[PDB]
Amino acid sequence: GCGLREAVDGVRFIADHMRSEDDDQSVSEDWKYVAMVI
């Protein structure tokens, strides 16, 4: 019941956190590449 809904919500939050982390890492790596080009 409530346990299943909590587990699903937690899994979803973990997924969203990981996607946000990937996005931030990608932007940081873009900045690194810009510095390398300069």
Partner: protein, 48 residues
């Protein structure tokens, strides 16, 4: 130092580099190498 800080996000390793510097030169130097949402989240985590 430039070679050491290289990553797939900026460089590609040529095949000849890989072959030479991971097979021959290391050996010549006597140094040897050693619900739908939940399942979707789990798959994304594994792939990541």
């Amino acid at each position: 130092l430039n070679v050491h800080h290289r990553s797939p996000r900026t460089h590609t390793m040529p095949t000849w580099v890989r072959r030479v510097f991971l097979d021959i030169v290391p050996r010549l130097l006597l140094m040897k190498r050693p619900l739908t949402r939940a399942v979707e989240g789990v798959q994304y985590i594994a792939d990541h």
